[PDB]
Amino acid sequence: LIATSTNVIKSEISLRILASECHLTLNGIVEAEAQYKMGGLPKSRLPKIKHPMIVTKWVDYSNKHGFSYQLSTEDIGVLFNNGTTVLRLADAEEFWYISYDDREGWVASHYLLSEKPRELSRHLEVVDFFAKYMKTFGREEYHKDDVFLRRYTRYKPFVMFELSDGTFQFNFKDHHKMAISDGGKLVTYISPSHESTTYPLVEVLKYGEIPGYPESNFREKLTLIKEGLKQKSTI
Ligand SMILES: [Zn+2]
Ligand SMILES: [Zn+2]
């Protein structure tokens, strides 16, 4: 696998955290494969099926001062070239400014668009551009499921998204998408018509393919996924 591009992470602590999640779900995938091959049944209660956060839209321009994406919450993020992020909530009133922190890797600050700080004014002009184009977070109820994009990597066969809740999303050339969550225990298949279905990974392995989508070439995709995770874990 040869990454054509990826965002630059300047923080060693951030890189450690990223590598840990890559390591974590790769281990999970390998364990699911071991359960399939050797038949062990974990004492642990099975993973509750929960649809993960997904990236529904993204764009990688060179001349607009950032990478941008939309999430299934309809939140819009801009990943700026210095590695900071503005995450604009779908309500079009609140946003997070996310920057580096020497203790936690990333830190997020809560703002209102109506009370925009002057030192983020140009950031929000860029965010406004991408909002037009498209059309960490505490424990408050409105924010407890908030997620942002920590790292993306573009490969020829797929683009890989690493979300802040530990979910990994893989968009393949054939417009089949797969998201791995819950430490590699759950796989979410997103069809080319955006029909979303989530399964325990071990169940898909035993079945041999994604239910309802025999053309999705699951085993090749899972191999690519493992290669992606393995590579990113070495940084
Ligand atoms: Zn380990
Ligand atoms: Zn808020």
Author numbering: 460 to 594, 602 to 701
The authors write:
Like Plks, Cdc5 contains a Ser/Thr kinase domain followed by a polo-box domain that mediates substrate recognition and sub-cellular localization. The polo-box domain is made up of two polo boxes that together define the p(S/T)-binding pocket. Cdc5 promotes the release of Cdc14 from the nucleolus and regulates the mitotic exit network (MEN)9,16–18 as well as cytokinesis. Here we demonstrate that the polo-box domain of Cdc5 uses distinct surfaces to bind phosphorylated and non-phosphorylated substrates.
We determined the crystal structure of the polo-box domain of Cdc5 using a fragment of Cdc5 that included residues 418–705. Similar to other previously determined structures of Plk1, the extension preceding the polo-box domain (residues 418–459) was disordered in the structure, while residues Leu460-Asp705 adopted the characteristic polo-box domain fold with the first polo-box defined by the β1-β2-β3-β4-β5-β6-α2 structure elements, and the second by the β7-β8-β9-β10-β11-β12-α3-α4 structure elements. The loop connecting the two polo boxes (Ala594-Ser601) was disordered in this structure. The distance between the last ordered residue from the first polo-box (Lys593) and the first ordered residue in the second polo-box (Thr602), as well the conformation of residues Thr602-Asp611 folding back towards β5-β6 rather than reaching across the first polo-box towards α2, suggested that the loop may had been proteolytically cleaved during crystallization. The side chains of Glu553, His569 and His609, as well as that of His524 from a symmetry related molecule, coordinate a zinc metal ion from the crystallization solution. This metal ion further stabilizes the conformation of the ordered portion of the loop and places the phenyl group of Phe603 inside an exposed hydrophobic pocket delimited by Leu546, Trp555, Ile557 and Ala567.
